[PDB]
Amino acid sequence: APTFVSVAPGQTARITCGEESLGSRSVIWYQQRPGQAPSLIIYNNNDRPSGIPDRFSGSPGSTFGTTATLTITSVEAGDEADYYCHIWDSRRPTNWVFGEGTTLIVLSQ
Amino acid sequence: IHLENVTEEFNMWKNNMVEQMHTDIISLWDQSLKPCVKLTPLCVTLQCTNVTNNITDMRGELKNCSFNMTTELRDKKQKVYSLFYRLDVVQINSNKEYRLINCNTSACTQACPKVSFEPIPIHYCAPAGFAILKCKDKKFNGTGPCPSVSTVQCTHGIKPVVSTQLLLNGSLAEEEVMIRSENITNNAKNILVQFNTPVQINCTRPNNNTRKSIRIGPGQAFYATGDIIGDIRQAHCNVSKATWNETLGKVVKQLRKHFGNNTIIRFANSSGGDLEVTTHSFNCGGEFFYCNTSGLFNSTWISNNDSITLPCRIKQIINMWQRIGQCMYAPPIQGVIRCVSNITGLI
Amino acid sequence: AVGIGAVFLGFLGAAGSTMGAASMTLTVQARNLLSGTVWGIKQLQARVLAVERYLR
Amino acid sequence: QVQLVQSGAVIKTPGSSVKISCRASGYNFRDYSIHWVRLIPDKGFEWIGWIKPLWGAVSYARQLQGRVSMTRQLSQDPDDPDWGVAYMEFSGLTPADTAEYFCVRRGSCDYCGDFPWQYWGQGTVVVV
Amino acid sequence: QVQLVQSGAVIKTPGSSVKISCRASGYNFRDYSIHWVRLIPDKGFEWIGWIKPLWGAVSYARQLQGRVSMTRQLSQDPDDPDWGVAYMEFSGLTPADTAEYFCVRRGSCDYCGDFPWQYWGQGTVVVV
Amino acid sequence: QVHLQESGPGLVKPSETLSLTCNVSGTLVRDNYWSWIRQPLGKQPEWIGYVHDSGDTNYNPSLKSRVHLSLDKSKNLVSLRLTGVTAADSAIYYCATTKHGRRIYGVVAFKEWFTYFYMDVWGKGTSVTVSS
Amino acid sequence: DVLMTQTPLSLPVSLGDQASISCKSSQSIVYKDGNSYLEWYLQKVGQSPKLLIYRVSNRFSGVPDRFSGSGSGTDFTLKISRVEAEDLGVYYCFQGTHLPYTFGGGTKLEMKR
Ligand SMILES: *[C@@H]1O[C@H](CO)[C@@H](O[C@@H]2O[C@H](CO)[C@@H](O[C@@H]3O[C@H](CO[C@H]4O[C@H](CO[C@H]5O[C@H](CO)[C@@H](O)[C@H](O)[C@@H]5O)[C@@H](O)[C@H](O[C@H]5O[C@H](CO)[C@@H](O)[C@H](O)[C@@H]5O[C@H]5O[C@H](CO)[C@@H](O)[C@H](O)[C@@H]5O)[C@@H]4O)[C@@H](O)[C@H](O[C@H]4O[C@H](CO)[C@@H](O)[C@H](O)[C@@H]4O[C@H]4O[C@H](CO)[C@@H](O)[C@H](O)[C@@H]4O)[C@@H]3O)[C@H](O)[C@H]2NC(C)=O)[C@H](O)[C@H]1NC(C)=O
Ligand SMILES: *[C@@H]1O[C@H](CO)[C@@H](O[C@@H]2O[C@H](CO)[C@@H](O[C@@H]3O[C@H](CO[C@H]4O[C@H](CO)[C@@H](O)[C@H](O[C@H]5O[C@H](CO)[C@@H](O)[C@H](O)[C@@H]5O[C@H]5O[C@H](CO)[C@@H](O)[C@H](O)[C@@H]5O)[C@@H]4O)[C@@H](O)[C@H](O[C@H]4O[C@H](CO)[C@@H](O)[C@H](O)[C@@H]4O[C@H]4O[C@H](CO)[C@@H](O)[C@H](O)[C@@H]4O)[C@@H]3O)[C@H](O)[C@H]2NC(C)=O)[C@H](O)[C@H]1NC(C)=O
Ligand SMILES: *[C@@H]1O[C@H](CO)[C@@H](O[C@@H]2O[C@H](CO)[C@@H](O[C@@H]3O[C@H](CO[C@H]4O[C@H](CO)[C@@H](O)[C@H](O)[C@@H]4O)[C@@H](O)[C@H](O[C@H]4O[C@H](CO)[C@@H](O)[C@H](O)[C@@H]4O[C@H]4O[C@H](CO)[C@@H](O)[C@H](O)[C@@H]4O)[C@@H]3O)[C@H](O)[C@H]2NC(C)=O)[C@H](O)[C@H]1NC(C)=O
Ligand SMILES: *[C@@H]1O[C@H](CO)[C@@H](O[C@@H]2O[C@H](CO)[C@@H](O[C@@H]3O[C@H](CO[C@H]4O[C@H](CO)[C@@H](O)[C@H](O)[C@@H]4O)[C@@H](O)[C@H](O[C@H]4O[C@H](CO)[C@@H](O)[C@H](O)[C@@H]4O)[C@@H]3O)[C@H](O)[C@H]2NC(C)=O)[C@H](O)[C@H]1NC(C)=O
Ligand SMILES: *[C@@H]1O[C@H](CO)[C@@H](O[C@@H]2O[C@H](CO)[C@@H](O[C@@H]3O[C@H](CO)[C@@H](O)[C@H](O[C@H]4O[C@H](CO)[C@@H](O)[C@H](O)[C@@H]4O)[C@@H]3O)[C@H](O)[C@H]2NC(C)=O)[C@H](O)[C@H]1NC(C)=O
Ligand SMILES: *[C@@H]1O[C@H](CO)[C@@H](O[C@@H]2O[C@H](CO)[C@@H](O[C@@H]3O[C@H](CO)[C@@H](O)[C@H](O)[C@@H]3O)[C@H](O)[C@H]2NC(C)=O)[C@H](O)[C@H]1NC(C)=O
Ligand SMILES: *[C@@H]1O[C@H](CO)[C@@H](O[C@@H]2O[C@H](CO)[C@@H](O[C@@H]3O[C@H](CO)[C@@H](O)[C@H](O)[C@@H]3O)[C@H](O)[C@H]2NC(C)=O)[C@H](O)[C@H]1NC(C)=O
Ligand SMILES: *[C@@H]1O[C@H](CO)[C@@H](O[C@@H]2O[C@H](CO)[C@@H](O[C@@H]3O[C@H](CO)[C@@H](O)[C@H](O)[C@@H]3O)[C@H](O)[C@H]2NC(C)=O)[C@H](O)[C@H]1NC(C)=O
Ligand SMILES: *[C@@H]1O[C@H](CO)[C@@H](O[C@@H]2O[C@H](CO)[C@@H](O[C@@H]3O[C@H](CO)[C@@H](O)[C@H](O)[C@@H]3O)[C@H](O)[C@H]2NC(C)=O)[C@H](O)[C@H]1NC(C)=O
Ligand SMILES: *[C@@H]1O[C@H](CO)[C@@H](O[C@@H]2O[C@H](CO)[C@@H](O)[C@H](O)[C@H]2NC(C)=O)[C@H](O)[C@H]1NC(C)=O
Ligand SMILES: *[C@@H]1O[C@H](CO)[C@@H](O[C@@H]2O[C@H](CO)[C@@H](O)[C@H](O)[C@H]2NC(C)=O)[C@H](O)[C@H]1NC(C)=O
Ligand SMILES: *[C@@H]1O[C@H](CO)[C@@H](O[C@@H]2O[C@H](CO)[C@@H](O)[C@H](O)[C@H]2NC(C)=O)[C@H](O)[C@H]1NC(C)=O
Ligand SMILES: *[C@@H]1O[C@H](CO)[C@@H](O)[C@H](O)[C@H]1NC(C)=O
């Protein structure tokens, strides 16, 4: 059930998570290192807080009938961890459980 | 042909041409529905549920109704779903079980979408033997002598709008805002007001619909609201608050002449009644709005940037002019629509 | 400019002028008196009413 | 002819609300206004409000707002398109409202105004 | 207005057959003829054939018979009686038929003839 | 800079009550808004509930029946109280603050906005494994 | 009444540029002739006002060809090709169909320095 996306170190890696969009959405992306708590990376649909670089990208939440995607540019070894989506849909009710975590792995270990 | 040294008594209240126009528009409006499809077979028991939405437990306003419907062939049948507004379904007495509101009295022809509802200017050319006079006095009260008349063979551009609370796109007066009545100290007669400066209104419907064709019968197609992609957002209207305060200042300045210079003119919302006499009715791109206007008509007036929003409700079936057994089903229209109009006056 | 005399040769322009000056332009009211599926019946009935009035 | 039947007499308590049904028959009810008026004993007449049954646009007196509501019921069958019903619900009853309530209709003439009242109701006696 | 939308560009093999859909919208499609014409690069224009969409009577050039077929599709719903579709299927493709294919409509005037071509298609590029 | 940590029993019999703690560092409890997150192994996390100041508190619709919370006002901690542990409660428990924003999509006076929460920082997590 | 306005009101234009002023008609100006009876007026100061052109197209005799006018029934304008010192003055738009005959405001072309 955790799907695997593998890309060369330095390329771009894309992550899809959750139900297809119906209303306006507010997606939140996390980052789960193995054996720890999560760590937030994207708090609005595209806005990111301090201490997390701008090589991350979110899908904009004004598009209807698409899937919330997280786009990673210039992957590395420290970015090889789990991700999580959390959609707040303006049409569908409150999501009290996160999306399915796609484990991110990079080749040439 | 501007005449000279001539006085003709005008009286708009006992006029007969307005009564001929009120007859002609009704007769022609009925004559523009006979080729369209009558919607008898759709009057059927509906099984309805709430539309997919984060329902808050305080509004309905959309219904997702599934029902059986006949096909091109007479034998077979099909389950089909549609989206109706809450003002068109009534709970007849698991999921609930509804019916349309017109089913209790009369089936109703829907309007063919090749037929537009928008007004085109209608002139009145006088026949042979007769003539049409025209006042030109700018201070013409409404009743009495107009000392500057002008005969004309055919009238000016009259665009027929349909509106209740405040009339739109109506030829505006030139020198100043004017009021008109029959006996101002009478209560049953309305007090018409015609503006000088056209205050602007913007109205819209944010829901991105999807028109869907259902074949009721061979050669007959039914147009149903298929899906709401985008977002569920309520229809509204906007006017400029500053110009509306200025325009009410003008009409309060005018109304103090007939009533005394020391009075307290205040504006209230409608007293009540049926729907389309309290709310503000009009049409916009072929779909009928009903907009609450309590947000404009509350003030008081003693002797010395932003924009007002006001909510709107939509019916799909309409019964204008209140006949016995004729309504119509205005079909939904594809995509977000909006229309802009000058406000000429109010009643 | 058109000219104010085109008022008097126009239809019904002498309606405010005196009786001694309407007799010169008296033929315009004579000439514009005649010439000028339910709607067809209404317009047809109005036109035959006008020609019956002229013939009377 | 024109007939204006009302409901019978009624006895109410202070604080209650009364509903009076003026049924009208004999003309096209979707055309002519209905007015309501009340005779207070040893105080005179007093107007209440009018209603235009084409849609149901109503108006009330100034000293009765927040207390009185008026509705109507048209006839929807095309076999009897003439008759109609008016409803007045008068709330906030005091012992000062012991009176006799009438519903009236306009004069039928094209010369008469609105307030000349030709046809009258039979008379509802209201005792608080 | 009058609009003549075509289908996009296409790449075909020698010996194949191409189908091009000229959709017309904005006028009564059951009245006016549709013509087809092709621009060969560095060879000029060349007429192909006409079609009258009231029934579908067609005619073709002499040096293209046995190679080209043209059909049409009317609109049967009375809510949109105006739009219509023309179809050209050109068979027996050679590398000499690398060209740009157009569908046209007549002039709208009552004085103009048949071959003065007012409205044009956007242009289908065909490479064999 | 914050540092938050919980302390519970971590060895719980089925059909038993439960409690946890929330120490503070950097920021006290009356300023921010607090939440609870749990995660079974090999599963996506689950967000139990959140508490504001002045009593604004909301929970799961699934766990609406049994869980109850409060703060520790004078001692500057956050409490927890769960009822009826079963085999579906074995999960590492977390503690987190939350920041809330509005995502307005339409006319503001028609209530066409919705709050959305996000966990800016995180606790360190304690395994509370049910023990039959 | 079919009163008009003039946009703009004063243009100081150098000697050899194009000046263009518009007059907008409330009601349409169409006679039974078909030609829109509007006149363009110039008045040098302290004089009698002249005539610039006729209806839209015809021109008053004794006037050079540095004047042109355009319009399509509703809103009218001019184009002056070259500027002189005699082109100082007050300009007007005049109607000829309906009574009373209305005027424009009046524009004063000036110099640039
Ligand atoms: C009749 O009148 C009524 C009222 O007069 C009209 O009703 C209005 O209707 C509007 C549309 O119908 C509706 O617009 C909404 O507005 C949303 C709210 O926007 C406001 O809040 C923004 C966030 O606030 C932040 O900042 C404040 C302090 O500044 C903090 O306190 C908050 O905590 C937040 O951090 C704010 O940014 C925004 O201001 C922007 O717009 C101003 C307009 O002049 C600019 O001056 C200002 O500089 C801001 O500009 C920023 O944003 C714009 C975005 O358009 C950008 O271009 C600029 O470069 C700059 O970055 C408001 O104050 C707003 O969120 C909505 O926009 C989002 O949703 C739509 C949905 O389709 C998207 O298309 C759109 O792109 C945008 O999505 C973006 O954001 C998403 C979420 O983060 C993100 O996923 C996505 O990728 C995009 O980046 C939309 O505009 C009005 O709210 C509404 N009411 C009022 C009172 O105006 C009615 O329409 C009238 N009727 C008619 C017929 O006209
Ligand atoms: C008070 O008065 C005001 C002033 O009139 C009223 O506002 C009007 O309301 C109208 C509603 O009845 C509204 O008309 C609709 O407009 C829609 C928008 O698209 C038009 O506008 C854009 C931009 O302005 C314009 O670009 C388009 O076309 C222009 O160019 C073509 C060239 O091909 C011209 O043919 C066309 O006339 C127009 O010309 C423009 O430029 C020339 C210069 O060359 C100027 O001289 C013109 O003045 C003009 O500026 C659009 O025309 C539009 O979507 C609507 O059209 C749909 O609906 C009608 C039925 O009403 C139907 O006949 C059409 O074919 C079309 O339906 C089809 O498409 C639908 C969508 O795909 C589909 O669902 C249908 O099934 C059909 O397939 C309609 O034209 C008008 O725009 C506004 N006025 C303004 C300024 O906004 C106001 O309503 C009045 N108040 C009340 C209460 O009534
Ligand atoms: C008004 O009310 C009506 C009902 O009265 C409602 O119509 C119904 O809408 C729902 C959606 O809300 C439809 O349910 C979906 O149907 C699609 C289409 O079904 C086709 O495919 C299946 C595949 O087996 C065929 O057997 C079938 O015959 C159809 O051809 C399904 O694809 C949907 O399944 C998805 O959603 C499930 C929800 O639990 C998931 O569990 C499932 O895994 C599927 O998800 C996958 O596909 C998604 C779409 O690609 C994708 O986003 C996911 O990531 C994942 O990959 C679901 O069954 C239902 O069929 C409609 N009924 C009818 C009669 O049309 C209207 O929608 C409603 N409208 C409004 C505005 O309220
Ligand atoms: C729209 O505007 C028109 C005007 O174009 C109004 O019509 C007239 O309005 C005036 C006043 O607004 C009315 O005039 C009043 O008439 C009274 C009756 O006397 C007249 O009639 C008799 C014969 O019946 C004549 O012999 C006599 O000479 C008059 O001609 C007068 O008594 C009134 O006098 C007032 O002024 C004096 C002093 O100024 C006071 O002492 C009086 O008490 C009184 O206040 C007054 O002159 C006239 O009757 C109206 N005519 C018509 C045909 O209506 C409309 O009323 C107006 N309508 C609306 C809806 O706005
Ligand atoms: C989907 O729609 C639901 C509709 O129920 C919506 O749930 C509600 O969201 C709001 C805001 O996110 C929650 O918070 C409320 O709003 C403010 C926040 O400060 C408070 O003042 C409110 O307190 C009042 O209401 C409480 C409950 O009625 C009372 O207990 C309290 O004393 C106050 O009167 C309140 O906290 C609100 O709690 C929820 N409702 C429920 C039942 O949980 C949800 O947010 C929407 N989701 C999306 C994604 O759109
Ligand atoms: C309202 O909803 C309609 C549909 O119900 C939206 O129309 C759709 O708009 C898109 C782009 O504007 C159209 O083009 C499509 O684009 C994709 C992009 O990859 C392309 O792959 C498709 O083949 C197609 O060309 C799309 O056709 C159109 N839908 C229909 C049925 O015509 C519209 O954008 C919405 N508008 C608003 C304001 O919400
Ligand atoms: C004119 O303005 C007045 C107030 O300024 C409006 O009166 C208001 O009417 C609504 C209902 O029409 C009342 O709403 C309430 O709703 C709840 C929930 O449904 C219900 O429980 C109540 O019994 C009541 O119906 C509202 O209280 C009332 N306000 C006052 C002060 O009485 C009136 O509707 C406006 N007229 C029009 C035509 O909008
Ligand atoms: C008609 O206009 C009046 C203004 O004369 C509107 O009254 C306004 O009502 C709103 C709330 O309904 C007031 O907003 C808030 O009121 C509280 C008092 O409860 C005040 O403490 C807040 O600071 C806030 O302003 C508003 O103040 C009030 N206007 C004035 C001048 O006091 C009335 O709502 C309008 N009617 C309708 C139906 O909208
Ligand atoms: C409602 O009434 C207003 C009057 O306040 C109308 O606004 C004005 O309309 C005229 C002609 O309709 C506009 O003149 C235009 O001038 C431009 C200048 O280049 C020209 O290109 C046009 O051909 C036309 O002559 C005038 O600008 C406009 N004023 C404003 C402030 O917009 C309005 O058209 C009426 N209708 C509606 C739907 O608002
Ligand atoms: C559809 O909407 C209606 C209206 O909100 C819901 O019916 C009731 O809504 C009230 C809130 O106003 C709740 O207190 C009731 O519990 C609701 N009744 C029931 C039986 O749930 C209704 O729940 C909505 N959903 C469906 C499927 O009908
Ligand atoms: C036609 O159907 C409507 C809808 O049910 C009826 O209107 C309701 O009638 C009942 C009792 O007469 C009232 O309690 C409701 O308030 C009415 N609702 C509405 C929206 O008016 C109507 O009576 C029916 N008429 C006939 C002649 O059968
Ligand atoms: C009604 O809508 C029109 C069109 O959107 C508005 O006109 C424009 O308003 C913007 C500012 O909102 C100006 O920047 C434009 O110059 C205006 N254009 C025109 C042609 O007027 C209008 O302001 C809206 N009215 C209200 C009251 O909001
Ligand atoms: C009423 O007041 C206005 C103030 O503008 C004044 O012009 C007018 O003459 C007054 N009329 C009367 C009857 O007092």
**B314, B332 in Cβ contact below 8 A?**
no
Asked if E81 reaches chain B (Cβ–Cβ under 8 Å), the answer is yes
Q: Which residues contact B68 (CB under 8 A, 6 or more apart)?
A: B44, B77, B78, B79, B80
Residues found in chain B: 347
Instruction: Tell me the shortest Cα–Cα distance from B55 to chain E, in angstroms.
Output: 37
Q: Whose CA is closest to F39, among F122, F101, F120?
A: F122
Total Cβ atoms within 10 A of residue B58: 6
Please write down the HEC assignment for all residues of chain B: CECCCCCEEEECCCCCHHHHHHHHHHHHHHHCCCCCCECCCCCCCEEEEECCCCCCCCCCCCEEEEEEEECCCCCCEEEEEEEECHHHEEECCCCCCEEEHHHHCCCCEECCCCCCCCCCCECCECCCCCCECCECCCCCCCEEEECCEECECECCCECCCCCCCCCECCCCCCCCCEEECCCCCCCCCCCEEEEEEEEEEEEEECCECCEEEEEEECCEEEEEECCCECCCCCCEEEEEHHHHHHHHHHHHHHHHHHHCCCCCECCCCCCCCCHHHHCEEEECCCCEEEECCCCCCCCCECCCCCEEEEEEEECCEECCCCCCCCCEECCCCCCCEEEEEEEEEEC
The residues facing B201 across adjacent strands are B239, B341
State residue B30 phi and psi, 5-degree precision: -70, -35
Q: How many residues does chain A have?
A: 109
- Give the torsion through C-alpha atoms of D91, D94, D96, D97, to 10 deg: 30
Whether the CB-CB separation of E72 and E51 falls below 8 Å is answered with yes
Stretch (H or E) spanning C7: helix C5-8
Q: Alpha-carbon distance E108 to E27, whole Å?
A: 10
User: Parallel, antiparallel, or unpaired: how do β-strands B109-110 and B328-329 relate?
Assistant: parallel
Is residue F126 within 8 Å of residue F10, measured between CB atoms? yes
DSSP string, D16-65: -EEEEEEEEESS-TTTS-EEEEEEETTTEEEEEEEEETTTTEEEE-GGGT
Ligand nearest to the CA of A90: 5
Phi, psi values for residue D70, rounded to 5°: -135, 130
**In one letter, which amino acid is D95?**
P
Q: Do the beta carbons of residue D34 and residue D54 sit within 8 Å? A: no
Ligand having the closest approach to the CA of B84: 3
Question: Rounded distance, CA E18 to CA E34, Å?
Answer: 18
| Chain D residues 26-45 within an 8 A CB cutoff of chain B | 30, 33
Contacts 24+ apart (CB under 8 A), D70-75: D70/D36, D72/D34, D74/B322, D74/D29, D74/D30, D75/D29
What are the backbone dihedrals phi and psi of residue C20, each rounded to the nearest 5 degrees, phi first?
-80, -10
Q: Distances in Å between the alpha carbon of G70 and those of D126, F58, G9, G39?
A: 78, 72, 19, 12
Select the residue of B2, B138, B174 nearest G98 (Cβ to Cβ). Answer: B2
CB of residue B284 inside a 6 A radius of ligand 1? no
Residues of D in contact with B187 (CB under 8 A): 50, 59
Minimum-distance CB partner of G99 among B2, B138, B174: B2
Q: Is B333 in the pocket of ligand 2 (CB under 6 A)?
A: yes
Query: Which residues, in sequence order, are bridge partners of residue B282?
Result: B289
| C-alpha distances in Å from residue D8, one per residue of D5, D122, G7 | 9, 9, 73
CB G49 within 8 A of CB G92: yes
- The string over A82-96, giving b where at least 16 C-beta atoms fall within 10 Å of a residue's C-beta and e elsewhere, is bbbbbbbbbbbeeee
E100-E101-E107 Cα angle (round to 5): 125
- The residue of chain E with its CA nearest to that of B113 is E79
The resolution in Å comes to 3.8
3-class secondary-structure state, position C14: helix
| Residue G50 to residue G63: CA distance in whole angstroms | 9
Token pair of B224 as six digits? 């149903």
Compute the nearest-CA separation of G27 from chain B (Å). Answer: 10
Q: In angstroms, what separates the C-alpha of F7 from chain B's closest C-alpha?
A: 37
Helix (H, G, I), strand (E, B) or coil at D89: strand
CB-based touch D/A (3+ pairs, under 8 A): no
Q: Does B112 touch chain E (CB under 8 A)?
A: yes
Tokens of B8: 């003709």
Dist CA B294 CA B296 (whole Å): 5
Question: Is there a contact between F59 and F52 (Cβ–Cβ < 8 Å)?
Answer: no
Ligand 4: residue of B14, B143, B148 to mutate (most ligand atoms within 8 A of CB) is B143
Give the separation between CA A83 and CA A87, rounded to whole angstroms: 13
C-alpha to C-alpha distance for G106 and D97, rounded to whole angstroms? 71
Name the experimental technique: cryo-EM
Q: How far apart are CA A25 and CA A41, in angstroms?
A: 17
Ligand 4 center to B175 CA (angstroms): 24
Q: Which residues 59-118 of F have a C-beta within 8 angstroms of A?
A: 60-62, 94, 96, 99, 101, 103, 105, 114, 116, 118
Q: What is the residue whose two structure tokens read 């006037």?
A: G63
